Design a protein around this ligand. Structure first.
Ligand SMILES: [Mg+2]
Ligand SMILES: [Mg+2]
Ligand SMILES: [Mg+2]
Ligand SMILES: [Mg+2]
Ligand SMILES: [Mg+2]
Ligand SMILES: [Mg+2]
Ligand SMILES: [Mg+2]
Ligand SMILES: [Mg+2]
Ligand SMILES: [Mg+2]
Ligand SMILES: [Mg+2]
Ligand SMILES: [Mg+2]
Ligand SMILES: [Mg+2]
Ligand SMILES: [Mg+2]
Ligand SMILES: [Mg+2]
Ligand SMILES: [Mg+2]
Ligand SMILES: [Mg+2]
Ligand SMILES: [Mg+2]
Ligand SMILES: [Mg+2]
Ligand SMILES: [Mg+2]
Ligand SMILES: [Mg+2]
Ligand SMILES: [Mg+2]
Ligand SMILES: [Mg+2]
Ligand SMILES: [Mg+2]
Ligand SMILES: [Mg+2]
Ligand SMILES: [Mg+2]
Ligand SMILES: [Mg+2]
Ligand SMILES: [Mg+2]
Ligand SMILES: [Mg+2]
Ligand SMILES: [Mg+2]
Ligand SMILES: [Mg+2]
Ligand SMILES: [Mg+2]
Ligand SMILES: [Mg+2]
Ligand SMILES: [Mg+2]
Ligand SMILES: [Mg+2]
Ligand SMILES: [Mg+2]
Ligand SMILES: [Mg+2]
Ligand SMILES: [Mg+2]
Ligand SMILES: [Mg+2]
Lengths: 62, 93, 77, 46, 102
RNA sequence: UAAGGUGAUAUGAACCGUUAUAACCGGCGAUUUCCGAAUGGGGAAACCCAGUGUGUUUCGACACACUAUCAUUAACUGAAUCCAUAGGUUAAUGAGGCGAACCGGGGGAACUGAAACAUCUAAGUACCCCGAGGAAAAGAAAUCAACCGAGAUUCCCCCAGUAGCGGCGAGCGAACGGGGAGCAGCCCAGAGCCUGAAUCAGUGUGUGUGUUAGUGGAAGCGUCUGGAAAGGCGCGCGAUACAGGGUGACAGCCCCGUACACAAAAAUGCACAUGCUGUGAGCUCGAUGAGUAGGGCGGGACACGUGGUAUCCUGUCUGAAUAUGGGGGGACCAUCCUCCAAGGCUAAAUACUCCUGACUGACCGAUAGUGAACCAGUACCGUGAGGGAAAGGCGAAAAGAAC
RNA sequence: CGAAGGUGUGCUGUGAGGCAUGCUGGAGGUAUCAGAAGUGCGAAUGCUGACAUAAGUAACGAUAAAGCGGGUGAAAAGCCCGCUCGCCGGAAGACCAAGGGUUCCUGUCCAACGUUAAUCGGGGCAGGGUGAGUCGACCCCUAAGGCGAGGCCGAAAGGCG
């Protein structure tokens, strides 16, 4: 990733950011109700969000 | 009262306990951990959009984290916010 | 403070010496007076905190010259 | 009997608090010395 | 820059198992390796009720200082020493004794 | 750069990666809550409350941005008062706070010494305050010398505990001259002529070269003892590498290194070169620092304590000459010699170490060495400023003792 | 094939000391001749630590007071249940503020803490528990007093307003 992302528009990257923040909410509830077997997912989502926001920022900045 | 990015971050977890189970059976009220800086309005909107049920009223308190000693040193758990979110009579989930 | 706006004269320190040559710390203050100068070129009086020495500087140079020094110094009047 | 320490948080903070140290040149020197000493608690706070 | 690597056949130079050979099973940041069939210990493993797990005497490879093993040059039957050089645009390992790439 | 990884106590869980988006290292970016100068107002730090402008497939409050003071500048405004000036608003730009030592300056003790004590000492020390820089300060003679000459400042060695000062007590303590480190000289007080002509700074580009990651880096095997070999014994080999460390006992040849040889996409230091905005070069004819020098009074500084006391600074009162002039040569006068005050700048040799890297020690080795080898400026004490500990070692490996 | 250190012994030196060696120990030591000192301890009401003594002595904190049956438990005068007895009752009850800060409730455990035992505890560990338009704070308003744009004053720092 980070290239697959960099080649989306600002419209699309906002959509994906929402999608990730929703996934993130759902994982949180799962984990919190002891239903998350795959603990590792949280960090990948958390970091995807970063990547997406880091790209929005670089596109706005210039 | 809302913007979706914020609403998604406001509810942290179900809280489980006898008091919370009874609050559901007896009063159609669900008990939650919510963001510390969350307001009753945010909590209400958030619950209503995400869990897609109608909210009557939200009550909230702040829990002080317990301290634990360790020989000469202390550790301190975090304060958090508890939300008693009452659903309207036509109960859901 | 006790400072001449023209010469910079300010309190200085030194000793009282007795007959038996005991030194005790003292000050020497300037001879200051607030005085109203007529400035022709500005149809106005300017009040300066000046030592008497400073007054003689103004008699010699002229108030216009001395006020010009105040500006250049950034000092306001 | 009655002892010398009678607490009051309000008076504690007004005499010794962070903002009171910051209000005067010498109180700001109390903080400087404490920070140079590497104190964990500069003042009694919340 | 590491001379001994996971899955290398090595020969032990030092210790009770001097002389034996075995496949490196993993190399640890501490400068130690676990080599198959080497430096065994018979640990007394405490029971753990979580799983109703009973205790037992277990045999395991204990970690051995990596400087206590040499790369094994199967082609000459001996302990050897690694060096590095560049072949193509890529860094390689090679046996000191016969100057051959690994 | 890589075949291993997701920092520690600290396992485990779920996972990432193996020829190149795992991880790790370095350059440059992004993000960077709240308190704190804290700067929208407030405040008992990490909290309370605003104004204006923007946004609402819901245009609620919630969110986002701006709004402190001071200084310089500009625009618009604008009194007493006719113009003016003060005042007022807004904008641009800057400052603010922190922090080792060294550094310039404003103030400035006492114990103590004098075998008491006041002049004197301690000492312009301790401390408080202001300000600056990589250094600061000082600096191109109104300086010395001594009738020969020297040629700014700063630092070192002598001169010398000398000459002197001194209740001539206790103490204080030069300079001339000599040997050295380093060396550099300029501008204004002004108009013309020639005119962007030397110089500096900010800064683009170039090469060079340092720094911030790295890359390669020689040569040992048998035997004995032993739990283990680096030890003993045998025979080899490398060395511009036998500095050091680690490895189951003491290793040139097992590992990391070391000698030597190398390397940067990126940022940055410093250097020559070069473009740029600005600065002005050399020439001729000028000009030559006044409440100043000097003086009376009171103090201070000069090694020099008012002394026969020159020189310097000045709180107070005064007050010149103008190169046919003026200062100094330790009271003062003549002669002679020397220099040119009342404008400014200037590198080096000099002072220091919070910090970064490398290396070293007839320095310590757990009551020592830091207060602190260890989660220590902690626990604890104190209202507070502040005070302030104790506390290292199983073993080679946890094989940390199943039953 | 056993260094330093520890503990014995034998010999030796006038002595401070030396050498040899048994045991302990388990990785270091260092002749000789020189070189440099944080170089020798019984006292300093010395400093730090450790351990004696008095001594199994005093004491166990209001003279409001206990007795029994049953239970839990390895153990019960002290904990749980029950019946009695006694004490306070303008308090020894209840409720606020200040101050503290989880001590609250439940389960579980008892080494240390509890002046005794302890199954109990304000002790250890884990989990739970604090729900507001109208109760308080914030908020609006001011008191003493504080701070204070400009300003007045002051060697600087600052003082006053
Ligand atoms: Mg509430
Ligand atoms: Mg603010
Ligand atoms: Mg307000
Ligand atoms: Mg403020
Ligand atoms: Mg008018
Ligand atoms: Mg500053
Ligand atoms: Mg005396
Ligand atoms: Mg600076
Ligand atoms: Mg300078
Ligand atoms: Mg001459
Ligand atoms: Mg001297
Ligand atoms: Mg000389
Ligand atoms: Mg020279
Ligand atoms: Mg090598
Ligand atoms: Mg050993
Ligand atoms: Mg002149
Ligand atoms: Mg003079
Ligand atoms: Mg005489
Ligand atoms: Mg001059
Ligand atoms: Mg260093
Ligand atoms: Mg110590
Ligand atoms: Mg020891
Ligand atoms: Mg020794
Ligand atoms: Mg010996
Ligand atoms: Mg000797
Ligand atoms: Mg004695
Ligand atoms: Mg007795
Ligand atoms: Mg008795
Ligand atoms: Mg008794
Ligand atoms: Mg009692
Ligand atoms: Mg017992
Ligand atoms: Mg507790
Ligand atoms: Mg309780
Ligand atoms: Mg007990
Ligand atoms: Mg408890
Ligand atoms: Mg309600
Ligand atoms: Mg005030
Ligand atoms: Mg002010």
């Amino acid at each position: 990733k980070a290239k697959e992302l960099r080649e989306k528009s600002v419209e699309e990257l906002n959509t994906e950011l929402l999608n990730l923040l929703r996934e993130q909410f759902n994982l949180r509830m799962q984990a919190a109700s002891g239903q998350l077997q795959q603990s590792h997912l949280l960090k990948q989502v958390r970091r995807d969000v970063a990547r997406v926001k880091t790209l929005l920022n670089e596109k706005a900045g210039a | 009262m809302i913007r979706e990015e914020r609403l998604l971050k406001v509810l942290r977890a179900p809280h489980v306990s006898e008091k919370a189970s009874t609050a559901m059976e007896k009063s159609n009220t669900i008990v939650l951990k919510v963001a510390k800086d969350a307001t009753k309005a945010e909590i209400k909107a958030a619950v209503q959009k995400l869990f897609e049920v109608e909210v009557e009223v939200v009550n909230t308190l702040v829990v002080k984290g317990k301290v634990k000693r360790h020989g000469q040193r202390i550790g301190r758990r975090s304060d958090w916010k508890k939300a008693y979110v009452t659903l309207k009579e036509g109960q859901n989930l | 403070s006790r400072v001449c706006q023209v010469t910079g004269k300010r309190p200085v320190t030194g000793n009282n010496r007795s007959h038996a040559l005991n030194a005790t710390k003292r000050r020497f203050l300037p001879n200051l007076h607030s005085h109203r100068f007529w400035v022709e070129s500005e149809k106005r009086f300017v009040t300066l905190r000046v030592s008497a020495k400073g007054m003689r500087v103004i008699d010699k140079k002229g108030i216009d010259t001395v006020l010009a020094e105040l500006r250049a110094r950034g000092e306001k009047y | 009997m009655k002892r010398t320490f009678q607490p009051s948080v309000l008076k504690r903070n007004r005499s010794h608090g962070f903002r009171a140290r910051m209000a005067t040149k010498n109180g700001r020197q109390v903080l400087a010395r404490r920070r140079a000493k590497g104190r964990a608690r500069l003042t009694v706070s919340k | 820059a590491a001379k001994i690597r996971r899955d290398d056949e090595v020969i032990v130079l030092t210790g009770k198992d001097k002389g034996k050979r075995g496949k490196v099973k993993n190399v640890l940041s501490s400068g130690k390796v676990i080599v198959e069939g080497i430096n065994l210990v018979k640990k007394h493993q405490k029971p753990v009720p979580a799983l109703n797990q009973p205790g037992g005497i277990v045999e395991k490879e204990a970690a051995i200082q990596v400087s206590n093993v040499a790369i094994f040059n199967a082609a000459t039957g001996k302990a050897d020493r690694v060096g590095f050089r560049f072949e193509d645009g890529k860094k390689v390992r090679f046996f000191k004794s016969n100057s051959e790439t690994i």
